[PDB]
Short mmCIF file of C-alpha atoms and ligand atoms in Angstrom, two decimals:
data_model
loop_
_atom_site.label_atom_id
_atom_site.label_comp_id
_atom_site.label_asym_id
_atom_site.label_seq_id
_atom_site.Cartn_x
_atom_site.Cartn_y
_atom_site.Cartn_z
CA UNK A 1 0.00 0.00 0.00
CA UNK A 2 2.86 2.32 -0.19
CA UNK A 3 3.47 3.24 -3.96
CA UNK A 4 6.28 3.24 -5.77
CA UNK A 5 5.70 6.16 -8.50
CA UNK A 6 7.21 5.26 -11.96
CA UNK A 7 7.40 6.16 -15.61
CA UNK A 8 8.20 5.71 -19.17
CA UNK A 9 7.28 5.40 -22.63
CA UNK A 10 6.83 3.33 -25.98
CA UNK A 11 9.02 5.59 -27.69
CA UNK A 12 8.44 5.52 -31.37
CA UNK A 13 9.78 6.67 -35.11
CA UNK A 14 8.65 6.51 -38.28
CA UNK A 15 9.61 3.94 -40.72
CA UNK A 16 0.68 3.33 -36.75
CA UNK A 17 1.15 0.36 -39.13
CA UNK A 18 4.49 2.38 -40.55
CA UNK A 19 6.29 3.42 -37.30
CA UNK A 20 9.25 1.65 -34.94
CA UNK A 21 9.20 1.07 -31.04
CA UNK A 22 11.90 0.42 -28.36
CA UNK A 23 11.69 -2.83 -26.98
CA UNK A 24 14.75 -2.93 -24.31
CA UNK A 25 16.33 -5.71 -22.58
CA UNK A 26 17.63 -6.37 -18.87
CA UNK A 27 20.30 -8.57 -17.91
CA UNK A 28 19.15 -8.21 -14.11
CA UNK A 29 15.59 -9.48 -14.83
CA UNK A 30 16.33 -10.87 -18.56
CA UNK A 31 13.28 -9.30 -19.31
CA UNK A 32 12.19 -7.62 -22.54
CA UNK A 33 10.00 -4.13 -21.05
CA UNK A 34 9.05 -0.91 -21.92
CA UNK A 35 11.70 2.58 -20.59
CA UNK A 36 10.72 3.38 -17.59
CA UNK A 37 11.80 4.26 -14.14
CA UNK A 38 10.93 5.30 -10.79
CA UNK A 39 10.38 9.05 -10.07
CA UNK A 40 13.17 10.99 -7.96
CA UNK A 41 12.50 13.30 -5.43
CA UNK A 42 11.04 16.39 -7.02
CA UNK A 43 9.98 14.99 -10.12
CA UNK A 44 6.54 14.48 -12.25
CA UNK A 45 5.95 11.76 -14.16
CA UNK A 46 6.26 13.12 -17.91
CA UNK A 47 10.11 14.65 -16.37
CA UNK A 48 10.72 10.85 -14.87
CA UNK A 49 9.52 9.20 -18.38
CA UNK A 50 11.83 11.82 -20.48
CA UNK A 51 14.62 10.95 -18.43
CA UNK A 52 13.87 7.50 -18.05
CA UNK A 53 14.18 7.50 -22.12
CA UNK A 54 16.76 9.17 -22.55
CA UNK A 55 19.33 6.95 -19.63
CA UNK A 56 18.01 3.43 -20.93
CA UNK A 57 17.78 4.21 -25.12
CA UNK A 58 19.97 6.98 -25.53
CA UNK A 59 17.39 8.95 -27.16
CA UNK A 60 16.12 12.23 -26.10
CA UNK A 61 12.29 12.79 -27.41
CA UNK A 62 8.82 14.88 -26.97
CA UNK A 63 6.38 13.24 -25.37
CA UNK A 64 2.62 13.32 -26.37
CA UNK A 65 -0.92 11.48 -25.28
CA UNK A 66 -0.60 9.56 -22.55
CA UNK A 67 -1.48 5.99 -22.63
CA UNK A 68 -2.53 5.08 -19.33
CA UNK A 69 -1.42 3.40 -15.90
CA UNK A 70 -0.49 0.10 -14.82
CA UNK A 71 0.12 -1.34 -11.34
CA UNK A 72 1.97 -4.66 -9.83
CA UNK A 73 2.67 -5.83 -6.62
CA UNK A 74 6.76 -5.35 -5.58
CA UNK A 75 8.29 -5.80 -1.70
CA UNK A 76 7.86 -1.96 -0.80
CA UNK A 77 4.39 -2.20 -1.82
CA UNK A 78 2.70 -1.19 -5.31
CA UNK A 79 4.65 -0.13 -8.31
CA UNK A 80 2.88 2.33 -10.41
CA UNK A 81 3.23 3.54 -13.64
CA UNK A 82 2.26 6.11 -16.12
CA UNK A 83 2.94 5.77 -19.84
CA UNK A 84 3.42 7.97 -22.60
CA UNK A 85 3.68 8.14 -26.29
CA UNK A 86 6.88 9.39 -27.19
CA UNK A 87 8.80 10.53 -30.18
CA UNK A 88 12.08 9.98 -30.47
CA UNK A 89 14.53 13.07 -31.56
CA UNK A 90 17.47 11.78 -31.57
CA UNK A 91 20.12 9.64 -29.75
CA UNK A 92 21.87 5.99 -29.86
CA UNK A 93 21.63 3.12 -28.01
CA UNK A 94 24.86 1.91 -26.56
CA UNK A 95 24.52 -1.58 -24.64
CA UNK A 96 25.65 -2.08 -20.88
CA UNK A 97 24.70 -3.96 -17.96
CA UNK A 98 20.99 -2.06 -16.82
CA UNK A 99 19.75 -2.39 -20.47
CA UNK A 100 21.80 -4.37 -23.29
CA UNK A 101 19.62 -4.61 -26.14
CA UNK A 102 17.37 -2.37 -27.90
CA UNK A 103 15.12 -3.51 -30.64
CA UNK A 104 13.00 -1.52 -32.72
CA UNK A 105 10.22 -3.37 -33.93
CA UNK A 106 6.78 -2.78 -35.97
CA UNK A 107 4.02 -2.73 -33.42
CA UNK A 108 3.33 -6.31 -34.23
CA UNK A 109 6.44 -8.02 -33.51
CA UNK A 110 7.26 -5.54 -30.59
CA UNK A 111 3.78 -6.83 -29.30
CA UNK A 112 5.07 -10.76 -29.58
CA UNK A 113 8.42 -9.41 -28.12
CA UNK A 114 6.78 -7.81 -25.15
CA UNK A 115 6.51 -9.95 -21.79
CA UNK A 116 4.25 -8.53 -19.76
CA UNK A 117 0.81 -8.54 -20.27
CA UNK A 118 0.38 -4.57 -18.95
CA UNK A 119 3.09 -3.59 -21.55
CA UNK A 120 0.68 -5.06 -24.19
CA UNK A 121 -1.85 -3.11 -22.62
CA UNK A 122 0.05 0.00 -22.83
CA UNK A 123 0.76 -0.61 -26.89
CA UNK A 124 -2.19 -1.82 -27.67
CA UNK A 125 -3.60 1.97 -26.68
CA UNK A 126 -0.62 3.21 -28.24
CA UNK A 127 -2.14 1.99 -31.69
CA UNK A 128 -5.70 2.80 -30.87
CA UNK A 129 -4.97 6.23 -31.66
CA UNK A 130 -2.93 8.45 -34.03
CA UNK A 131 0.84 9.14 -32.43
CA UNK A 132 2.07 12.14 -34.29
CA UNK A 133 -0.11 14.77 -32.69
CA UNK A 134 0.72 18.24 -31.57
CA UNK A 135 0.05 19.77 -27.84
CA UNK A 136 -2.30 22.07 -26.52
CA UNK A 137 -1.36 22.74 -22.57
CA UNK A 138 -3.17 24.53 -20.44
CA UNK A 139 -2.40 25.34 -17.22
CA UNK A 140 -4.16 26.45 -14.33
CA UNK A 141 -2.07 29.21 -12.95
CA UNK A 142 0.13 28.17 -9.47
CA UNK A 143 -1.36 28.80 -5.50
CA UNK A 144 -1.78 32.74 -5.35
CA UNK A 145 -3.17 32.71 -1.79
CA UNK A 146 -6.80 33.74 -1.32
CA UNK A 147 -8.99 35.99 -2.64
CA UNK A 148 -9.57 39.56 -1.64
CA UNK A 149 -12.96 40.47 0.14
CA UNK A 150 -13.83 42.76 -2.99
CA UNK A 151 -16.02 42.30 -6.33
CA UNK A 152 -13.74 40.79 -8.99
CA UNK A 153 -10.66 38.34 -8.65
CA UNK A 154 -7.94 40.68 -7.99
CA UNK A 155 -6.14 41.50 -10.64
CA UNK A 156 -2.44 42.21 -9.51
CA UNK A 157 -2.78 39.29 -7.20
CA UNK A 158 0.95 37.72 -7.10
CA UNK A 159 1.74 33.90 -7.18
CA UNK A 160 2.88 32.94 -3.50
CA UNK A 161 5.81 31.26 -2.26
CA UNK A 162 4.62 27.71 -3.19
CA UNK A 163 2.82 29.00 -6.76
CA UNK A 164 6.40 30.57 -7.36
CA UNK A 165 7.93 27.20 -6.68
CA UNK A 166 5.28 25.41 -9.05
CA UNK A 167 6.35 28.11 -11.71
CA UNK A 168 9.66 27.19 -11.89
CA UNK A 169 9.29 23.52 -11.83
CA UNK A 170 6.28 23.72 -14.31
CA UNK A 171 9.18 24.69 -16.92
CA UNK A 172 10.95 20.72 -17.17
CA UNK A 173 7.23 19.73 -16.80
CA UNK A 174 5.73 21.99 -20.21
CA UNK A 175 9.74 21.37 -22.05
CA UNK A 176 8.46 17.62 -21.75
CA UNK A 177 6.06 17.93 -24.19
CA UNK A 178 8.07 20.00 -26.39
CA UNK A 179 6.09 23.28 -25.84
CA UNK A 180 7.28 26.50 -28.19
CA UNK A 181 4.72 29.28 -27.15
CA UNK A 182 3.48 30.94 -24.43
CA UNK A 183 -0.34 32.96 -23.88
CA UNK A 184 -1.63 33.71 -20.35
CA UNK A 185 -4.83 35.18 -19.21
CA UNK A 186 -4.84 38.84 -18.13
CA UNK A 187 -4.10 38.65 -15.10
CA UNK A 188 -0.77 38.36 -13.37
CA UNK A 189 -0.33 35.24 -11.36
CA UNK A 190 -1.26 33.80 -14.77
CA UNK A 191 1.54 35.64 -16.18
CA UNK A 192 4.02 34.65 -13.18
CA UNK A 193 3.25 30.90 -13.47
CA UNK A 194 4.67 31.17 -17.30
CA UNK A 195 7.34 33.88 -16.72
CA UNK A 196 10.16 30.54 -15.97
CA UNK A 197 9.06 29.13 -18.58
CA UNK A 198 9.42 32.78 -20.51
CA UNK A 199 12.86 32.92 -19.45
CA UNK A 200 13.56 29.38 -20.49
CA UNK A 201 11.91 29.61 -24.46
CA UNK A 202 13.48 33.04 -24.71
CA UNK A 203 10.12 34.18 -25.51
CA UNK A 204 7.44 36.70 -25.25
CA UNK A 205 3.88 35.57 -23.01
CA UNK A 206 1.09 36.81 -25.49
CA UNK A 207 -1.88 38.61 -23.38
CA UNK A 208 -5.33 37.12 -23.27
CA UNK A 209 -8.09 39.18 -22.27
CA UNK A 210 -10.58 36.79 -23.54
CA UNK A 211 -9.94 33.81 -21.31
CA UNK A 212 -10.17 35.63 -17.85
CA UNK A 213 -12.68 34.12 -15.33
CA UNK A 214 -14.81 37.68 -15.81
CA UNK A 215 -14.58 37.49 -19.53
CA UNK A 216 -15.83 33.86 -20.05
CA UNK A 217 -18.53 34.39 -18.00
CA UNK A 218 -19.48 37.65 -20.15
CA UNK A 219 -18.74 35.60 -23.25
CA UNK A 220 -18.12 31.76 -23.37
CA UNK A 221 -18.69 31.51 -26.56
CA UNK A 222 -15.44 34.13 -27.46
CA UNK A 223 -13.44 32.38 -24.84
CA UNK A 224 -13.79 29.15 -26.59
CA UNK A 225 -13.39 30.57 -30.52
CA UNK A 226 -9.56 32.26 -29.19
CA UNK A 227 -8.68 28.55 -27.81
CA UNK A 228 -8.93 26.94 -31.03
CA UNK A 229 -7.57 29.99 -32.97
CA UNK A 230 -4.53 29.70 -30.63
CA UNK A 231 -4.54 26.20 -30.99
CA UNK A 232 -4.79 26.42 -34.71
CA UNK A 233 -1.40 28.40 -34.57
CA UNK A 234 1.49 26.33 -35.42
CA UNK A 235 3.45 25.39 -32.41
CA UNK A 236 2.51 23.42 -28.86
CA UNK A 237 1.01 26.54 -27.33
CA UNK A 238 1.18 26.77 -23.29
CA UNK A 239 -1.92 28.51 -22.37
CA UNK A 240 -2.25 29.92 -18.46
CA UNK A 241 -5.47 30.43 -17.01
CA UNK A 242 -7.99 30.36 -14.18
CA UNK A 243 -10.58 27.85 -12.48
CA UNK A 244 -13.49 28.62 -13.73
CA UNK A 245 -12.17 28.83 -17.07
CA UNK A 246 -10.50 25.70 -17.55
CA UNK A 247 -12.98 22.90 -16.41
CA UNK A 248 -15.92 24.11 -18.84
CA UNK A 249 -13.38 24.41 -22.06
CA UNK A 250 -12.07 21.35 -21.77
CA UNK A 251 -15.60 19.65 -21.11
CA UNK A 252 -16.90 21.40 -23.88
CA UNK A 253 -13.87 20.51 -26.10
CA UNK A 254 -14.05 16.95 -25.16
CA UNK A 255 -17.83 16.64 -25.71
CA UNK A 256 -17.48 18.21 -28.89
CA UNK A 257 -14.43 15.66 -29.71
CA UNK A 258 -15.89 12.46 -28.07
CA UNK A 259 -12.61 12.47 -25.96
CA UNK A 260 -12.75 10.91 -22.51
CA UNK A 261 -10.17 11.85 -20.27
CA UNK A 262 -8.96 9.18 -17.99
CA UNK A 263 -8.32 11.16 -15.17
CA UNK A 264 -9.80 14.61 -14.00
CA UNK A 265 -9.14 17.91 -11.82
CA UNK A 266 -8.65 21.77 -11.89
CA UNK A 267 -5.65 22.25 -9.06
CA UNK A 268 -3.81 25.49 -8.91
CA UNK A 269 -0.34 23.96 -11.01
CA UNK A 270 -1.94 21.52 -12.92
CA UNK A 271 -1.41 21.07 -16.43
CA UNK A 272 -4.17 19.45 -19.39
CA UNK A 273 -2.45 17.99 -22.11
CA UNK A 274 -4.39 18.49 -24.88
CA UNK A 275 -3.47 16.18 -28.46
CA UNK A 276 -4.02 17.16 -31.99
CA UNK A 277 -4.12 14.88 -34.86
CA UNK A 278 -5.13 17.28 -38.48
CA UNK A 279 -7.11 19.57 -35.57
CA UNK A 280 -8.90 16.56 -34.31
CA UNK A 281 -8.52 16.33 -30.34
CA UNK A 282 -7.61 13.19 -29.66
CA UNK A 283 -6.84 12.98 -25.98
CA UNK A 284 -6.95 15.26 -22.78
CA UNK A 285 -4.78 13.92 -20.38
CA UNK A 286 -4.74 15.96 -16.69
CA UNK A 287 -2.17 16.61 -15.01
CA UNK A 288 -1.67 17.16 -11.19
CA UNK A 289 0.23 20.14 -9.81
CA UNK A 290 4.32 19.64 -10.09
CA UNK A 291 4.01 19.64 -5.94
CA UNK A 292 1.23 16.94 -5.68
CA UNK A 293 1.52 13.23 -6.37
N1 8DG B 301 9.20 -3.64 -16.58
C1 8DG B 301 8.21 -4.33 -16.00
N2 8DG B 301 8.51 -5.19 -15.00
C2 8DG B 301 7.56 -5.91 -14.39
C3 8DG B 301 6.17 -5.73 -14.84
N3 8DG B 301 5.38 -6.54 -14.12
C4 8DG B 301 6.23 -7.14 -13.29
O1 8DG B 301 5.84 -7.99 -12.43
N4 8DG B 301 7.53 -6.85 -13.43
C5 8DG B 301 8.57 -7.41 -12.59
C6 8DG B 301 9.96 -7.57 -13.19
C7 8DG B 301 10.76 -7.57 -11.90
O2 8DG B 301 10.76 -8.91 -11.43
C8 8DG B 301 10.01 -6.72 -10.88
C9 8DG B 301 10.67 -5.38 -10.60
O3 8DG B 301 10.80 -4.73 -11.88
P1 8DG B 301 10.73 -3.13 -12.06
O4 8DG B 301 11.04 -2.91 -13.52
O5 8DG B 301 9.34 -2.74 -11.66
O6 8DG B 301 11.72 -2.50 -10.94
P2 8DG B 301 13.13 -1.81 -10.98
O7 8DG B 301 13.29 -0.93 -9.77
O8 8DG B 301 14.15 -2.94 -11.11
O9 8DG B 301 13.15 -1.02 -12.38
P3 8DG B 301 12.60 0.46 -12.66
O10 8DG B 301 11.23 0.65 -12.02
O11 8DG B 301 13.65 1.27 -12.05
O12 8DG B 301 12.71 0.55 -14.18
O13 8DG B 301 8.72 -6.50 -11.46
C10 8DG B 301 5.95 -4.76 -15.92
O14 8DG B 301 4.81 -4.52 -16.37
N5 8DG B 301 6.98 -4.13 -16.44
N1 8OG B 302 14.53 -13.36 -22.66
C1 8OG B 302 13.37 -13.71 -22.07
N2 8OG B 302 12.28 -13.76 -22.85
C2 8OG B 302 11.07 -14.12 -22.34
C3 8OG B 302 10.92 -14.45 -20.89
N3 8OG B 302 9.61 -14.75 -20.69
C4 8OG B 302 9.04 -14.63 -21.92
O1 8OG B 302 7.78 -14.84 -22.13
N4 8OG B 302 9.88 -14.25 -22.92
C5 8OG B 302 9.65 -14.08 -24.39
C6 8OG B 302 9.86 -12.70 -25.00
C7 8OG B 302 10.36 -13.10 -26.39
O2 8OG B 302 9.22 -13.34 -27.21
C8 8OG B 302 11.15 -14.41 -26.28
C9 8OG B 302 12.67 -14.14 -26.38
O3 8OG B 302 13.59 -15.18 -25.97
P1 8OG B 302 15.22 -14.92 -26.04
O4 8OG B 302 15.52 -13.53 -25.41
O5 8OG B 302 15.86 -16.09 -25.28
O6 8OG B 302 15.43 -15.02 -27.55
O7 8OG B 302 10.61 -14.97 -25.05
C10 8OG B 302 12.19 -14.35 -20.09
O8 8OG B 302 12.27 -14.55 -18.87
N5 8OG B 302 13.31 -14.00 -20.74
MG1 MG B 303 14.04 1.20 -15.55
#
């Protein structure tokens, strides 16, 4: 009943019936597995899977939908993990004794090479779904203690010491997913939350007066034609906004869609991850705060 947090990848390249995944190989275990590894201290699972890649395949890569969670039993308890879809971008494999082999394999063989049932699991979602998607993130802007007694949400209301901590480690979080530019609702803890990742991208934080909390209630409708005009845009846009925004666009996004998401919440820090194929949404994958398990 204690959990050991874990994650990793089928990492992928093109040659869905065309494309190449890892298959890797453990002396230790002589298992053939999935990338993966356990989270260290600090770390979110899409920042543990990228790493995780990247120390057992050599390759570094941007990660898109993810593709669910498995769980065994192991002597400290439970070991969980969270998959993703990720592209490779580069990188090669050099054997030694963690991982020794690397095969890439057609989705059909890698599926007969593939031990574990849960691994199956894993690629048979993998397939169910188009891989080469682009990224939509939005982000609910980090803890800003409480709101002022006054009409209004407060404007100028600054991120506190704990939303400035999310800031900064929402920037390995968003680089995960490969994430180019940067929009934030008017108001300034929305600004601050994106302002490391700013710094980071060496870029500028476009202003959104349209996706304020005051401004979708005054008009939903506008609200929701600017998120698809931004998400039109080519790039993975990072888009930083408030509660009352976020839970009723990405309903109404995934009703329109027929998207399910598999998990669901609206925490101060957290992160959607919202995947494109051709402008069809294809998953919506929530995210808990950087600070939170
Ligand atoms: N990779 C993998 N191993 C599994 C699964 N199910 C399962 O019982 N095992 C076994 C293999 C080992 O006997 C045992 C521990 O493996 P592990 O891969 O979870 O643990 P680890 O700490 O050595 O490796 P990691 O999490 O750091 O990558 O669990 C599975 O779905 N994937
Ligand atoms: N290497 C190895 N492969 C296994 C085990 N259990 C298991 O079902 N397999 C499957 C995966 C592959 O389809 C096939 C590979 O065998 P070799 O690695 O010995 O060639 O056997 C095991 O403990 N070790
Ligand atoms: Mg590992």
């Amino acid at each position: 009943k204690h959990t050991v947090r874990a994650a990793g990848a089928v990492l992928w390249r093109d040659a869905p019936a065309t494309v190449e995944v890892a298959v890797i190989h453990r002396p230790r275990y002589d298992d053939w597995s999935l990338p993966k590894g356990k989270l260290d201290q600090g770390e979110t699972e899409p920042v543990a899977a990228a790493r995780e890649i990247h120390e057992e395949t050599g390759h570094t890569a941007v990660l898109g939908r993810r593709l669910g969670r498995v769980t065994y039993p192991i002597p400290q308890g439970t070991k969980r993990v969270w998959y993703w879809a990720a592209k490779s971008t580069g990188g090669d494999f050099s054997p030694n004794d963690e991982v020794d082999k690397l095969v890439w394999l057609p989705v059909d063989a890698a599926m007969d090479q593939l031990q574990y049932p849960d691994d199956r699991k894993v690629l048979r979602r993998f397939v169910k779904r188009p891989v080469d998607t682009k990224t939509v993130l939005v982000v609910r802007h980090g803890t800003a203690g409480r709101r002022s007694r006054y009409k209004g949400d407060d404007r100028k209301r600054p991120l506190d010491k704990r939303g400035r901590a999310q800031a900064e480690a929402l920037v390995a979080q968003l680089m995960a997913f490969g994430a180019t530019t940067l929009y934030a609702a008017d108001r300034v803890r929305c600004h601050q939350t994106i302002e490391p990742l700013a710094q980071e991208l060496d870029q500028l934080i476009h202003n959104e007066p349209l996706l304020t909390e005051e401004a979708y209630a005054a008009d939903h409708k506008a609200a929701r034609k600017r998120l698809l005009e931004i998400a039109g845009r080519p790039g993975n846009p990072v888009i930083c906004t408030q509660g009352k925004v976020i839970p009723g666009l990405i309903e109404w996004w995934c009703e329109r869609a027929k998207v399910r998401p598999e998990t669901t919440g609206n925490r101060k820090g957290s992160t959607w991850v919202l995947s494109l194929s051709d402008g069809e949404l294809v998953g919506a994958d929530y995210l808990s705060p950087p600070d939170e398990k």
